[PDB]
Amino acid sequence: MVKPNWDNFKAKFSENPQGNFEWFCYLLFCQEFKMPAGIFRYKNQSGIETNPITKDNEIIGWQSKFYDTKLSDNKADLIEMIEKSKKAYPGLSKIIFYTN
Amino acid sequence: VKPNWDNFKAKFSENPQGNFEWFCYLLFCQEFKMPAGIFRYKNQSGIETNPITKDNEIIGWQSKFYDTKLSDNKADLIEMIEKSKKAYPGLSKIIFYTN
Amino acid sequence: VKPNWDNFKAKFSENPQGNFEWFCYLLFCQEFKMPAGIFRYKNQSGIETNPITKDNEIIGWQSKFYDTKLSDNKADLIEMIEKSKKAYPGLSKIIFYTN
């Protein structure tokens, strides 16, 4: 295998850490909740979509953010994220949140 | 070559503090012409090695690698100064290295 | 494959404790069928992650990598037991891993 290393990530993707983190989280969400496509479809960085999914009479969505400091320091951003998520689609009931 | 601390943190992510200490030990030995090194106890207190002597001035050194601005870390420095003279009474100078 | 701790210490000499903890986390998740992992606080006390629940039994885990025989280390274990119940009052079982 291979251990996680966010210093490799920040050195490698230095011009856009947030957008690449969003790509990575979308791929993992598809592998767990949607129906699995393969490597040839996942290679398109342009293919991100934020649509929620319906399961077991519940509605499930997702969001993610990459940070250099403690989550105590970014409360305004977390609040902004929650309210934007409900604004974008009003039927939402559960949110998976990813961070480093 | 150019100083880049992202390269450093990517290369030495399993142990940053321990590799920064070695970088400073090599530069200290180059600066004060001690090519065969210096004696060092296990878990040595105050400063990183035993002191050197030069022109009746006695000198030691200390290094710290931080993510914070130095103003957040004052208590470490006060502790360093007090814990050194407890152990090495004649000490005259300390050189401090940081990123 | 066969267990060899000289191979381990040669491979992971920059950080033995941190890699042994990950070996135990993966084996725990395999044993108790938690394939997507477990929540964990920064500098978490007593046990390595938050507990799991199973058949009305609440379970945690702890790992230590040592050069000494376990008899030399009794105070760590007493501290472990006492510091866990302070934080997670309903806890029922702890699983302990060591070399």
Structure description:
This is part of a larger assembly, with three copies of chain A. Helix content of chain A is 41%, strand content 17%. Chain A has 100 residues and is α+β, with helices and mostly antiparallel strands. A three-stranded mixed β-sheet of chain A has the order 1-2-3. In chain A, helix 4 (75-88) links the parallel strand 2 (58-65) and strand 3. The longest helix of chain A is centred in the first third of the chain and has 16 residues, at 17-32. Chain A is globular. Chain A starts with 5 loop residues before the first helix and ends with a strand. The B-C interface holds B 14-15, 18 and C 14-15, 18. It is classed as antiviral protein. Keywords: phage defense, nlr, stand, antiviral protein.
Could you give a quick summary of the protein structure above?
It is classed as antiviral protein. This is part of a larger assembly, with three copies of chain A. Chain A is of the alpha+beta class and 100 residues long.
